[PDB]
């Protein structure tokens, strides 16, 4: 009896959720293979132990599904300089270490099983990096590029009207781009452009030569009299000055503008045309619904939240310009990011289709304003810091090759799809994630190991045409026992979301919770069938409370009021949060923060870091005399008991007691205390464990913003929600019918 096997009885047990993170389970292998098995977090699978049947894998209840995050930064990477890649001639597999040698000057593809021959470059050819790491990195050459490699190309497009300036964006994002301007990836062929609109289109000529920028209006974006690209994506190098001051006046450019109007639409157009001979990467501020020109839209939110409560009013884009121009971008390797920092509803649904299609990044800001909002300021400006420093790959594509048998099915994610395996990524950055779902077209009884293997091709910031691989190789059984021993709970439930996403679009959220709940009750039910209480195997035994927490998501609750572009950017976050990040998100991580001790703590960055343990999801676990900290992924919480301990109100908050604490509270203070240098040392490895920066918010008892933090104590009852003990006793009574 495997231990991810061994029964746990849901019904009784009250302590499931382990107080460490969970780990993936490790595909069963053998000893030297296993040594060299992809990272879990580059490149996972739901199911470790692969159906060998299609039979097998619809008896199991449970999906087969590929988690990706191929381009993240890694501390080392096989970088290979060969003027041969070795791949496979019939499939194109590149060579790796699950091949198998039939004679030291032959290979045998893992994939399709074809016989090739070693080339003599390739050489002992088994010691060669390609087959003594499951993650490496070559370097093409002119075989692998359609044209020369792209320089770096960025564009940025700026929302000017009225409202856009009351919000105060401009300061934060230009002052950032001056701090980081010698930072942007490239080399001296980097070019860069600015674009603001209102009721107008405005370029900026910055060529080299002026003493001074030239902005150039338009309302008309075919006008003839408009430059050459040339002048308007200028080489970063060469007009420094320019632009400089460029960033420097953008910000008390449009003081007070009598301009309300914002004509996104043509801006996109106009970039769209500026950008197709180069590709790159345009970046969009954006702070409320288009009204001008093309694409503009309509306020057609729903107010009435009980209208939406089986299919979400407007959920889909209102119409098709937005996923079209991306496309059109897709196809000239030009990726759009959104950044929306919107007070009023502004339609991200149509909006999000700008980046959904060209591999782009939507970042929401909800009610930015640099003064009465400065938290989404502060974060803003950190998260620009990531964003115009980490790396990035451009005019890239990636395919994911699988043995014989195995087929990608469905894609989730920011991309253009091309093929039933391959993906074009206008642009590919290191916080991006990816799923797919796969089917069993022919049994897998050739083997009894089965191979996955990811390609990304791209155009470094430097020029040079890269191919990242990640092979990953997993056994295959004919069990339905088997099957449950190696399912990853957090990879099904990853995949689930994205399904889930689908499905409350293409059908209605009723559906898709339905589905949800479905996989379940399907999933244990099958397992019952391999061996009063609702049983199940270690493996799954967080299942049922993870598909609770989905439930209950913003994403997919309906408990509760929800604006639409709120639940919007909810979806969005699980179609491009890798894995890591996105488990955060759909189950928060709570500590008690008010007794932080140095037993169990890790020392890292020089530092003692506390590590407290984890708790569930459940009201039953907030003492009313402690602190508590909520690790939403994306937003942090500290809940303040009203008989919390002052000795923490005093040291850590900075307050004589709780009364003193004031409400709106988003920082802890650098106080000169020991008990407030853990907290701090325990958030700042909190903050750097991801890409980026969660506002916090420090929430007291007393009843204003206490239901954003019992909110996601999804274990609990709520207005029209089941406790986790219902919930259970709902899907014992589903299985028992
Ligand atoms: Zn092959």
Same mark, same amino acid.
Request: charged share 20%; aromatic share 8%; proline share 6%.
């Given at each position: 009896?495997?231990?991810?096997?061994?029964?746990?009885?849901?019904?009784?047990?009250?302590?499931?959720?382990?107080?460490?993170?969970?780990?993936?389970?490790?595909?069963?292998?053998?000893?030297?293979?296993?040594?060299?098995?992809?990272?879990?977090?580059?490149?996972?699978?739901?199911?470790?132990?692969?159906?060998?049947?299609?039979?097998?894998?619809?008896?199991?209840?449970?999906?087969?599904?590929?988690?990706?995050?191929?381009?993240?930064?890694?501390?080392?990477?096989?970088?290979?300089?060969?003027?041969?890649?070795?791949?496979?001639?019939?499939?194109?597999?590149?060579?790796?270490?699950?091949?198998?040698?039939?004679?030291?000057?032959?290979?045998?593809?893992?994939?399709?099983?074809?016989?090739?021959?070693?080339?003599?470059?390739?050489?002992?050819?088994?010691?060669?990096?390609?087959?003594?790491?499951?993650?490496?990195?070559?370097?093409?050459?002119?075989?692998?590029?359609?044209?020369?490699?792209?320089?770096?190309?960025?564009?940025?497009?700026?929302?000017?009207?009225?409202?856009?300036?009351?919000?105060?964006?401009?300061?934060?994002?230009?002052?950032?781009?001056?701090?980081?301007?010698?930072?942007?990836?490239?080399?001296?062929?980097?070019?860069?452009?600015?674009?603001?609109?209102?009721?107008?289109?405005?370029?900026?000529?910055?060529?080299?030569?002026?003493?001074?920028?030239?902005?150039?209006?338009?309302?008309?974006?075919?006008?003839?009299?408009?430059?050459?690209?040339?002048?308007?994506?200028?080489?970063?190098?060469?007009?420094?000055?320019?632009?400089?001051?460029?960033?420097?006046?953008?910000?008390?450019?449009?003081?007070?503008?009598?301009?309300?109007?914002?004509?996104?639409?043509?801006?996109?157009?106009?970039? *769209?045309?500026?950008?197709?001979?180069?590709?790159?990467?345009?970046?969009?501020?954006?702070?409320?619904?288009?009204?001008?020109?093309?694409?503009?839209?309509?306020?057609?939110?729903?107010?009435?939240?009980?209208?939406?409560?089986?299919?979400?009013?407007?959920?889909?884009?209102?119409?098709?310009?937005?996923?079209?121009?991306?496309?059109? &971008?897709?196809?000239?390797?030009?990726?759009?990011?959104?950044?929306?920092?919107?007070?009023?509803?502004?339609?991200?649904?149509?909006?999000?289709?700008?980046?959904?299609?060209?591999?782009? &990044?939507?970042?929401?800001?909800?009610?930015?304003?640099?003064?009465?909002?400065?938290?989404?300021?502060?974060?803003?400006?950190?998260?620009?810091?990531?964003?115009?420093?980490?790396?990035?790959?451009?005019?890239?594509?990636?395919?994911?090759?699988?043995?014989?048998?195995?087929?990608?099915?469905?894609?989730?994610?920011?991309?253009?799809?091309?093929?039933?395996?391959?993906?074009?990524?206008?642009?590919?950055?290191?916080?991006?994630? *990816?799923?797919?779902?796969?089917?069993?077209?022919?049994?897998?009884?050739?083997?009894?190991?089965?191979?996955?293997?990811?390609?990304?091709?791209?155009?470094?910031?430097?020029?040079?045409?890269?191919?990242?691989?990640?092979?990953? &190789?997993?056994?295959?059984?004919?069990?339905?026992?088997?099957?449950?021993?190696?399912?990853?709970?957090?990879?099904?439930?990853?995949?689930?979301?994205?399904?889930?996403?689908?499905?409350?679009?293409?059908?209605?959220?009723?559906?898709?919770?339905?589905?949800?709940?479905?996989?379940?009750?399907?999933?244990?039910?099958?397992?019952?069938?391999?061996?009063?209480?609702?049983?199940?195997?270690?493996?799954?035994?967080?299942?049922?409370?993870?598909?609770?927490?989905?439930?209950?998501?913003?994403?997919?609750?309906?408990?509760?009021?929800?604006?639409?572009?709120?639940?919007?950017?909810?979806?969005?976050?699980?179609?491009?949060?890798?894995?890591?990040?996105?488990?955060?998100?759909?189950?928060?991580?709570?500590?008690?923060?008010?007794?932080?001790?140095?037993?169990?703590?890790?020392?890292?960055?020089?530092?003692?870091?506390?590590?407290?343990?984890?708790?569930?999801?459940?009201?039953?676990?907030?003492?009313?005399?402690?602190?508590?900290?909520?690790?939403?992924?994306?937003?942090?919480?500290?809940?303040?008991?009203?008989?919390?301990?002052?000795?923490?109100?005093?040291?850590?908050?900075?307050?004589?007691?709780?009364?003193?604490?004031?409400?709106?509270?988003?920082?802890?203070?650098?106080?000169?205390?020991?008990?407030?240098?853990?907290?701090?040392?325990?958030?700042?490895?909190?903050?750097?464990?991801?890409?980026?920066?969660?506002?916090?918010?420090?929430?007291?008892?007393?009843?204003?913003?206490?239901?954003?933090?019992?909110?996601?104590?999804?274990?609990?009852?709520?207005?029209?929600?089941?406790?986790?003990?219902?919930?259970?006793?709902?899907?014992?009574?589903?299985?028992?019918?």
């Amino acid at each position: 009896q495997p231990e991810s096997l061994r029964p746990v009885n849901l019904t009784q047990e009250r302590n499931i959720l382990p107080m460490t993170p969970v780990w993936a389970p490790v595909p069963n292998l053998n000893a030297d293979l296993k040594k060299l098995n992809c990272s879990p977090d580059s490149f996972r699978c739901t199911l470790t132990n692969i159906p060998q049947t299609q039979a097998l894998l619809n008896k199991a209840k449970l999906p087969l599904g590929l988690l990706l995050h191929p381009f993240r930064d890694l501390t080392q990477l096989p970088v290979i300089t060969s003027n041969t890649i070795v791949r496979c001639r019939s499939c194109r597999t590149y060579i790796n270490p699950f091949v198998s040698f039939i004679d030291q000057r032959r290979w045998k593809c893992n994939l399709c099983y074809r016989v090739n021959d070693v080339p003599e470059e390739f050489m002992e050819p088994h010691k060669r990096p390609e087959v003594q790491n499951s993650t490496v990195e070559f370097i093409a050459s002119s075989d692998y590029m359609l044209r020369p490699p792209q320089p770096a190309v960025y564009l940025f497009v700026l929302d000017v009207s009225h409202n856009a300036v009351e919000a105060g964006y401009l300061t934060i994002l230009c002052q950032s781009l001056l701090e980081n301007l010698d930072k942007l990836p490239g080399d001296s062929r980097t070019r860069i452009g600015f674009m603001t609109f209102d009721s107008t289109i405005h370029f900026y000529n910055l060529q080299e030569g002026l003493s001074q920028p030239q902005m150039l209006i338009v309302s008309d974006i075919d006008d003839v009299f408009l430059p050459t690209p040339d002048s308007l994506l200028v080489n970063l190098y060469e007009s420094k000055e320019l632009i400089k001051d460029l960033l420097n006046a953008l910000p008390n450019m449009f003081t007070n503008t009598r301009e309300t109007h914002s004509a996104l639409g043509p801006a996109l157009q106009a970039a *769209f045309k500026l950008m197709s001979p180069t590709g790159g990467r345009v970046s969009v501020f954006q702070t409320q619904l288009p009204s001008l020109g093309a694409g503009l839209l309509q306020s057609r939110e729903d107010p009435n939240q009980r209208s939406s409560t089986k299919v979400v009013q407007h959920l889909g884009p209102a119409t098709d310009f937005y996923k079209k121009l991306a496309l059109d &971008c897709s196809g000239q390797q030009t990726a759009v990011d959104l950044f929306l920092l919107s007070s009023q509803y502004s339609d991200l649904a149509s909006l999000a289709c700008m980046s959904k299609y060209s591999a782009g &990044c939507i970042y929401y800001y909800p009610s930015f304003h640099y003064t009465h909002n400065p938290s989404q300021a502060e974060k803003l400006q950190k998260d620009l810091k990531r964003y115009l420093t980490r790396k990035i790959g451009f005019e890239a594509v990636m395919r994911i090759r699988c043995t014989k048998g195995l087929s990608m099915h469905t894609f989730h994610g920011n991309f253009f799809v091309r093929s039933t395996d391959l993906l074009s990524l206008a642009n590919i950055n290191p916080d991006a994630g *990816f799923a797919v779902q796969l089917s069993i077209e022919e049994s897998l009884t050739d083997t009894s190991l089965v191979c996955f293997q990811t390609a990304l091709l791209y155009t470094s910031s430097k020029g040079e045409r890269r191919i990242r691989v990640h092979t990953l &190789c997993l056994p295959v059984v004919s069990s339905l026992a088997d099957v449950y021993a190696g399912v990853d709970v957090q990879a099904a439930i990853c995949l689930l979301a994205n399904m889930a996403v689908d499905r409350s679009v293409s059908s209605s959220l009723s559906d898709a919770r339905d589905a949800l709940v479905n996989a379940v009750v399907d999933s244990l039910s099958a397992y019952g069938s391999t061996v009063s209480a609702l049983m199940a195997p270690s493996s799954l035994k967080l299942f049922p409370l993870y598909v609770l927490a989905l439930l209950k998501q913003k994403a997919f609750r309906t408990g509760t009021s929800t604006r639409l572009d709120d639940r919007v950017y909810a979806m969005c976050q699980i179609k491009s949060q890798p894995l890591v990040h996105l488990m955060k998100m759909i189950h928060p991580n709570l500590y008690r923060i008010d007794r932080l001790t140095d037993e169990g703590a890790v020392h890292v960055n020089d530092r003692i870091v506390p590590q407290p343990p984890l708790q569930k999801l459940s009201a039953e676990k907030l003492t009313r005399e402690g602190a508590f900290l909520m690790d939403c992924g994306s937003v942090f919480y500290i809940w303040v008991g009203k008989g919390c301990d002052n000795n923490f109100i005093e040291d850590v908050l900075g307050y004589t007691n709780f009364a003193s604490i004031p409400q709106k509270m988003t920082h802890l203070p650098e106080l000169d205390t020991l008990s407030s240098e853990r907290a701090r040392s325990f958030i700042t490895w909190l903050r750097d464990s991801r890409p980026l920066s969660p506002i916090l918010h420090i929430v007291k008892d007393e009843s204003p913003a206490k239901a954003e933090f019992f909110q996601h104590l999804i274990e609990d009852r709520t207005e029209a929600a089941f406790s986790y003990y219902e919930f259970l006793l709902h899907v014992q009574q589903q299985i028992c019918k």
